Design a protein around this motif. Structure first.
Motif, PDB file in Angstrom:
ATOM      1  N   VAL A  72      -8.689   2.696  -0.136  1.00  0.00           N
ATOM      2  CA  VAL A  72      -9.415   2.190   1.076  1.00  0.00           C
ATOM      3  C   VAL A  72      -9.539   3.323   2.160  1.00  0.00           C
ATOM      4  CG1 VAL A  72      -6.875   0.914   1.233  1.00  0.00           C
ATOM      5  CG2 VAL A  72      -8.487   1.120   3.276  1.00  0.00           C
ATOM      6  N   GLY A  73     -10.804   3.255   2.863  1.00  0.00           N
ATOM      7  CA  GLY A  73     -10.957   4.169   3.855  1.00  0.00           C
ATOM      8  C   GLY A  73     -12.010   5.220   3.491  1.00  0.00           C
ATOM      9  N   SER A  74     -12.851   4.850   2.387  1.00  0.00           N
ATOM     10  CA  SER A  74     -14.171   5.572   1.882  1.00  0.00           C
ATOM     11  C   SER A  74     -15.210   5.694   3.016  1.00  0.00           C
ATOM     12  CB  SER A  74     -14.689   4.943   0.633  1.00  0.00           C
ATOM     13  OG  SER A  74     -13.976   3.850   0.282  1.00  0.00           O
ATOM     14  N   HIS A 115     -13.371  -0.859   7.695  1.00  0.00           N
ATOM     15  CA  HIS A 115     -13.315  -0.986   6.033  1.00  0.00           C
ATOM     16  C   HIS A 115     -13.166  -2.138   5.608  1.00  0.00           C
ATOM     17  CE1 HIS A 115     -13.694   3.405   6.920  1.00  0.00           C
ATOM     18  NE2 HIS A 115     -12.463   3.282   7.312  1.00  0.00           N
ATOM     19  N   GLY A 120      -2.624  12.590   6.875  1.00  0.00           N
ATOM     20  CA  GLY A 120      -3.694  12.243   5.988  1.00  0.00           C
ATOM     21  C   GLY A 120      -4.342  13.290   5.434  1.00  0.00           C
ATOM     22  N   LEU A 155      -9.448   2.723   9.953  1.00  0.00           N
ATOM     23  CA  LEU A 155      -9.224   4.038   9.337  1.00  0.00           C
ATOM     24  C   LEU A 155     -10.038   5.109   9.709  1.00  0.00           C
ATOM     25  CD1 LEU A 155      -8.057   4.000   5.893  1.00  0.00           C
ATOM     26  CD2 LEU A 155      -8.531   6.057   6.780  1.00  0.00           C
ATOM     27  N   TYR A 161      -4.083   0.479  -1.991  1.00  0.00           N
ATOM     28  CA  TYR A 161      -3.713  -0.717  -1.837  1.00  0.00           C
ATOM     29  C   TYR A 161      -3.395  -1.291  -3.152  1.00  0.00           C
ATOM     30  CZ  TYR A 161      -4.596  -5.908  -2.153  1.00  0.00           C
ATOM     31  OH  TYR A 161      -4.661  -7.069  -2.424  1.00  0.00           O
ATOM     32  N   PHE A 204       0.868  -1.067   0.326  1.00  0.00           N
ATOM     33  CA  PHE A 204       0.128   0.084   0.098  1.00  0.00           C
ATOM     34  C   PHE A 204       1.018   1.208  -0.044  1.00  0.00           C
ATOM     35  CE2 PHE A 204       0.550   1.181   4.367  1.00  0.00           C
ATOM     36  CZ  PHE A 204       0.783  -0.037   5.031  1.00  0.00           C
ATOM     37  N   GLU A 242      -6.991  -0.507  -5.156  1.00  0.00           N
ATOM     38  CA  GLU A 242      -8.187  -0.077  -4.164  1.00  0.00           C
ATOM     39  C   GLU A 242      -7.605   1.216  -3.346  1.00  0.00           C
ATOM     40  OE1 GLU A 242     -10.279  -3.356  -2.027  1.00  0.00           O
ATOM     41  OE2 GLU A 242     -11.304  -1.855  -0.902  1.00  0.00           O
ATOM     42  N   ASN A 299       0.594   5.318   1.211  1.00  0.00           N
ATOM     43  CA  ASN A 299      -0.284   6.138   2.128  1.00  0.00           C
ATOM     44  C   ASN A 299      -0.194   7.683   1.370  1.00  0.00           C
ATOM     45  OD1 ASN A 299      -0.792   4.609   4.217  1.00  0.00           O
ATOM     46  ND2 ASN A 299       1.306   4.957   4.979  1.00  0.00           N
ATOM     47  N   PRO A 300      -1.335   8.474   1.670  1.00  0.00           N
ATOM     48  CA  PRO A 300      -1.386   9.825   0.986  1.00  0.00           C
ATOM     49  C   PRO A 300      -0.394  10.780   1.885  1.00  0.00           C
ATOM     50  CG  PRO A 300      -3.073   9.482   2.704  1.00  0.00           C
ATOM     51  CD  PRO A 300      -2.574   7.857   2.361  1.00  0.00           C
ATOM     52  N   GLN A 340      -5.088   7.393  11.077  1.00  0.00           N
ATOM     53  CA  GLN A 340      -5.907   8.399  10.310  1.00  0.00           C
ATOM     54  C   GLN A 340      -5.449   7.924   8.572  1.00  0.00           C
ATOM     55  OE1 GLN A 340      -4.593  12.193  11.450  1.00  0.00           O
ATOM     56  NE2 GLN A 340      -6.600  12.527  12.577  1.00  0.00           N
ATOM     57  N   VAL A 341      -4.691   7.206   8.423  1.00  0.00           N
ATOM     58  CA  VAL A 341      -4.201   6.834   7.038  1.00  0.00           C
ATOM     59  C   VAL A 341      -4.264   5.278   6.775  1.00  0.00           C
ATOM     60  CG1 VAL A 341      -2.021   6.760   5.773  1.00  0.00           C
ATOM     61  CG2 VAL A 341      -2.666   8.972   7.005  1.00  0.00           C
ATOM     62  N   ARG A 360      -7.925  16.032   1.942  1.00  0.00           N
ATOM     63  CA  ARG A 360      -8.082  14.744   2.392  1.00  0.00           C
ATOM     64  C   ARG A 360      -7.492  13.837   1.396  1.00  0.00           C
ATOM     65  NH1 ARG A 360      -6.821  10.754   5.541  1.00  0.00           N
ATOM     66  NH2 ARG A 360      -8.391   9.805   6.815  1.00  0.00           N
ATOM     67  N   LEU A 415      -6.762   9.297   0.779  1.00  0.00           N
ATOM     68  CA  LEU A 415      -6.971   8.078   1.153  1.00  0.00           C
ATOM     69  C   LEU A 415      -5.782   7.191   0.707  1.00  0.00           C
ATOM     70  CD1 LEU A 415     -10.617   7.583   1.258  1.00  0.00           C
ATOM     71  CD2 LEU A 415      -9.472   8.108   3.131  1.00  0.00           C
ATOM     72  N   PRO A 416      -5.548   6.083   1.690  1.00  0.00           N
ATOM     73  CA  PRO A 416      -4.251   5.087   0.994  1.00  0.00           C
ATOM     74  C   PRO A 416      -4.701   4.333  -0.092  1.00  0.00           C
ATOM     75  CG  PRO A 416      -5.335   4.427   3.017  1.00  0.00           C
ATOM     76  CD  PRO A 416      -5.871   5.838   2.871  1.00  0.00           C
ATOM     77  N   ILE A 442      -6.999  12.052  -4.066  1.00  0.00           N
ATOM     78  CA  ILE A 442      -7.474  13.083  -3.283  1.00  0.00           C
ATOM     79  C   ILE A 442      -9.097  12.993  -3.177  1.00  0.00           C
ATOM     80  CG2 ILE A 442      -7.548  15.752  -3.311  1.00  0.00           C
ATOM     81  CD1 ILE A 442      -4.930  15.877  -4.533  1.00  0.00           C
TER      82      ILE A 442
END
Lengths: 357, 340, 366, 366, 367
Positions: free
Chosen positions: D114-116, E212, D58, E161, D289, D36, D112, D38-39, E190-191, D284, D286-287, D269
């Motif tokens: 992830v974290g939506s 998630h 994040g 998350l 994968y 993965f 993907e 990360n942002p 948070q990430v 914001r 999100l990461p 983004i």
């Protein structure tokens, strides 16, 4: 002589109304019935006068809000309902000597909502777009849209689910969850309750905000619906005469018309118009055109004559009360069936579930 | 032999106007006709002057709202209508001994709405985007849109359907449901009346908000429409010269040209422009381009030749009144038959 | 025996347009990559970031009309068509066997570049919170217009305007009045078969006037789409894997007349609204092209006499002269002799082929 | 007598971390690597404490707008940047006998964001929906969106393009166009400038509003991007565990991992967060994968084409600047060409040229 | 004898409840189970009176915002959670001759969100569309939407998350990241933290804004989700009884039910209903129906039953705590394995070893 040979095309035997179905055609003949269904949402068609009822025909009568959190009693002429028809087809068979029997079978459907360009009427006495001078354009129909249609061989099975289980729907003129269960609604009626089940047998009687197409275990109906919420969502419609829906399932069968009837169900909501007053909204619905293609299919006899032979055994005997051998207070402890022979087992009452260990 | 061979392509026999259709070509020849239909919606093309008409040609005049719930007179130059044309094609061969005819048959269509980029005209005297200081840009066309087009071998069939059925449409210059059914509109004309039927035959005369393509029992026309509602909906349009629409049906026939004519019908509404005044709301429509591909098909004559001759003579001769020779006050006295 | 590789296509040479000179072979494939910049209003020429403020890549402003009848659009505010012409090498200068050979575009990978550039929400644009002038600098938004074309000749255009009473400046821009030397008529607001043009220049034909014209037969593939509105979020999708096939119904695709390959483009994203009187600026993005070409054997459709007469007619100047044609013609008689015949008794007999054979014409005596 | 047979399925040899790749598995094996990114777009990951950095991790720090049309300093911690990682795969060829090497080759990717569902956190200290009474919902993340990802055997080639070419970016902390060109940005940087080109080799360093995936001549990367603009656009995300992306190209190769390195690049983004203050916006991200499926490909040995034969044909040209060997101030004194053999002439300083058609010996002095 | 033959269709042996599955059928028999999951969206079902709870059942109770940037503490009845169910299927055959056993295998799923037309309730006591006169339509459900469903043979793996790692989620009645990792949340949460992982064993306990679906290296569940955000976004739902989802994978297997159970997970959020008093923003969720089609598949036993029953019988022996013959303080000083015979070697203190394929005499130690 070397003639030109036009391309082969299905041969029309007869064309007309519903009386055309009495002509005996043969086992491999194909019928195309053409019908429509009108939006029965609120104001009925029964007052024809453009002045008496104002002719909100095709519209609802006007949405009244609730007076308190606990006081909700809308009206019957305000709730859009399910349109339905039943096409009674001719009886096909005389073959109760072999257990095969032939009925009608819906193969295709060509359907369409009619009247979308009429929503381009932006003259008229609706709330204007420039409201601080009351000029501009008459605001057209917008809002929530609801488009469901069903084609089956029996009535559409419905499932009750409401936003508020405390709404006081009228007890006459409209079919409600309470009309079916015979007692006031519970909190399980704002989620799926397996008890709030009805059938779409009346037309303009079952409101679409209580009754939704039921995904029952096994079914003889193909329904296609879609929803678009919001308050000012633009209506979107697409019409053409070029595409069909195939009504056959994985086994390639498609709705078998039991009895001899073919049931059509629909609801087409376009949104609401808001009037030039307190913002009274009126739901708009448009008609739906159907073109069902039926063929004849050989099936195994759906008429159990043992039913008649045992209704003769039963109508000679009185009806008895007795103690409950059926339901939830059954006094039947156990039923077990034996068919062949096996080697003597070990534990014969052995659990086949691992969670019971 | 020695030098290479280009790939085979269809051989062009003749190119030009509708005059080149008089060349006899044979049974396996394909014809492609370019044509366009203009947005007949509101202001007609007759006052060509850019001052005496203001030139709302391409636009509607200006929408006037109803004065009460019962009074609604919509001013024919306000209502967009159906555009239509008919292309007259040459007569074809026949073979009386096998009773087969040849007629034209639409096989595909390339269609396109032209002038989308003209809606990027943001100068001009429309209601500004910053209306408190009257600055910004001139608001572009937005709102309800309606794009229908049909290609058939006979005029498009229509089905009457309206909002309020108490509207007082003008009794001349427009085709109403009252023009077709000589009575006033009823409440059943707000849902679906099988009585409210018509043919898209004249042009710029059938308002698009009254007349909708009718799904008749059996049909010889392929129509494709779509509607987008709202008051500020962005217009969307995709143009290309690269995709075709097949007009063939399930049996693979496509629109056979009855008589000998090929009927094109369209309506392409893009939305409204709003003026820097009382917010009058002229419609905008854009032209549609058609490219119909036709071929010749051998069909079977379905009628007896004696019946066709009888019909020819019944249409040739004028329906005469005359003194009664049939009925109860007959003037024929005796009729005798001899054979020998 | 060790493992062998897979048959990947073999690269002969990579470089610039220089590489197209080297004679490569009959069945070779060329991939040319290029790009077109957004030529919409402010030209590229004042390169300084202080003189033109460098609205390069943007338009210059938007000036509303002052009345219904008086609208002057100020050429630097009108987005226009980008175009280019790739000059490909001559192919059959050697000879031909009554079938020539030309370049043929078979595919195109295209892409609009710089969409993440539209995430610049700092800057001096109309703020989001307009009461306190805080928040976010409003990003580019509004009407979008994305067209591109790949052809073997310049793109034909069709004129169509919102208003026919618009006074476009007579110099620096090509309008309907420039091509048809008269004013615009009301028919120019719907569809005039007369207001046609070719995309010849670059940054000259405004897109609000000039639309890709669906002519009868064409050597160009164009794909366009329009999204109207005033706010209308921009949407763009870029990828290095999708391709467009330029072959037509018959499997040919754009044959490069002469040896030119014409790319046309316009990619409007929306407006930027300034922190002032709400002045709008058009934004456009560059478009990348990757065209794949091959050599096609093509038969000459025209006869040799026609080509020779065309050559001479374009070399020699066009003559005014006295009227040897028309109703006031100055030719007196034209006689044609083919064979030989006995002496006729009348020297000035008239003879003419009515429909099949020559008929001597007496003069009306009896 | 018999017994059942399950269906065939690829046999798992080993499963673990990156050290699992040390087992020698043969030519026809297939490797699948989950990873993965990360942002790294805005505030860095370094200060872990939830009060020191506020933990905008994040997120981005608050966007500050420009002060005037010419002063614009965008404050590095407010600038979303590209995420990138490199996976060092084991080195494959251990035998130098024949003309075949072996490379890794990315075949497919499952990816993907992830974290939506975290974006449904509407309790919190954000600008409310009913801001009059300061009640309602803490406005969810909305705005302009930007999702790109790439898989290759090389770092992603980037192209520079900016909204404004003035835009004083800080000179240390981010890689801007000036960091690469060494000069100030020009107006051509708001359109496609072929000079502003870079490679995504550092992480959290190249801002997405400056650097965009470059469509170049020949590529070893598959990138997929899409952009949605606006200020209140609803975010949309679709996650599943059933669809894969094929990374093979038209010839069916897919990114060959050179140096045995696999490069994953991404930026996801989601919109902005607005604070319960001056409307300060925070991006914001999100990461993302990745699951890359890799195989081994037999490739030809390139080294026998040594550098002296594979000379500076590419853009290896440093420059020409030297003493003048051209023009009027040339320092070339004399050039002579010899081709054959002739009997010894007289004057050895005889000069000999070739005229407009053929050869001619210049007359002798005198 | 000469009557026409209808077409062959699958033969239904029996239908009913989950008790119908107790009939042993055969290797090629197919089962179809229809089930449903109700929305666990804030308020629980149990206080069933329509006045004690007001019956926000199917809705959440009401979103209370944070009072300051540093303290955010939401009530448990305001967080929509994952719905899940387990369906315990019967035991199947085994074959220790070739160490194969048959498992239940989910092949298809017909799923649907029920009740979309209930969102046409625009009468009622909600924020009216014309607020200056409190007339018009009661605003329908709108907002952010979130629709996920999963079908597998084991419980759905989750991955934590959060928007803010400083939220004070209650320590009871809800499974948060702090419940799984006994420490507080960090900024990594948070990430993406590979540490904050969970399963979906409970129901109405794991909030959707924290947990998630995790794209793990491996998986036996197929999950399909999609998110739509915003504040006034209109709901959009499509229903029909004619579309099927294929749960098979690249190899054509599909979720194998380990432990005989079959796991359904879902969350279907439709937006918010805004009340009239303030802008209180209860969530709305609708039930999801599942029709899962299962077959039996023969699979190889991954673990030899020999070692399993050996370890089962060894755990019956007494366990002793003696001097360490394991680890780093081993008292084992030597281990030698001799198999065959060889000519007497040279070095009597030679060392021989096996290096990942085959035996190599340890390098001639005079390096």
């Amino acid at each position: 002589k070397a003639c030109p040979r036009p391309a082969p095309v299905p041969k029309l035997l007869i064309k007309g109304g519903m009386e055309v179905l009495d002509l005996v055609t043969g086992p491999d003949s194909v019928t195309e019935i053409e019908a429509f269904l009108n939006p029965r949402m609120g104001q009925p068609p029964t007052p024809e006068s453009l002045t008496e009822g104002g002719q909100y025909y095709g519209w609802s009568r006007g949405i009244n809000l609730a007076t308190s959190d606990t006081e909700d009693s809308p009206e019957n002429n305000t709730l859009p309902t399910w349109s339905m028809a039943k096409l009674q087809l001719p009886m096909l068979n005389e073959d109760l000597t072999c257990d095969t029997l032939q009925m009608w079978e819906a193969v295709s459907v060509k359907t369409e909502v009619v009247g979308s360009g009429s929503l381009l009427d932006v003259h008229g006495f609706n709330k204007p777009t420039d409201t601080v001078n009351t000029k501009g354009i008459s605001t057209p129909v917008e809002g929530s849209q609801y488009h469901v249609f069903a084609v089956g061989g029996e009535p559409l099975d419905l499932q009750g689910l409401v936003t508020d289980a405390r709404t006081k729907y009228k007890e006459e003129g409209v079919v409600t969850i309470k009309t079916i269960t015979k007692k006031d609604m519970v909190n399980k009626d704002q989620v799926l309750n397996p008890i709030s089940k009805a059938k779409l047998d009346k037309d303009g009687m079952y409101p679409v905000e209580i009754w939704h197409p039921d995904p029952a275990k096994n079914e003889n109906t193909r329904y296609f619906g879609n929803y678009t919420g919001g308050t000012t969502t633009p209506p979107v419609l697409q019409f053409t005469n070029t595409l069909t829906t195939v009504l056959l399932d994985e086994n390639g069968v498609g709705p078998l018309c039991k009895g001899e009837g073919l049931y059509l169900s629909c609801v087409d909501i376009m949104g609401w118009r808001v009037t030039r007053n307190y913002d009274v909204h009126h739901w708009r619905g448009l008609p739906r055109y159907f073109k069902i293609t039926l063929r004849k299919r050989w099936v195994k006899n759906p008429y159990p004559m043992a039913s008649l032979i045992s209704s003769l055994f039963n109508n000679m005997l009185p009806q008895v009360q007795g103690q409950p051998m059926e339901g939830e207070n059954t006094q039947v402890e156990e039923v077990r069936v034996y068919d062949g022979t096996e080697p003597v087992p070990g534990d014969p009452d052995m659990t086949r579930y691992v969670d019971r260990f």
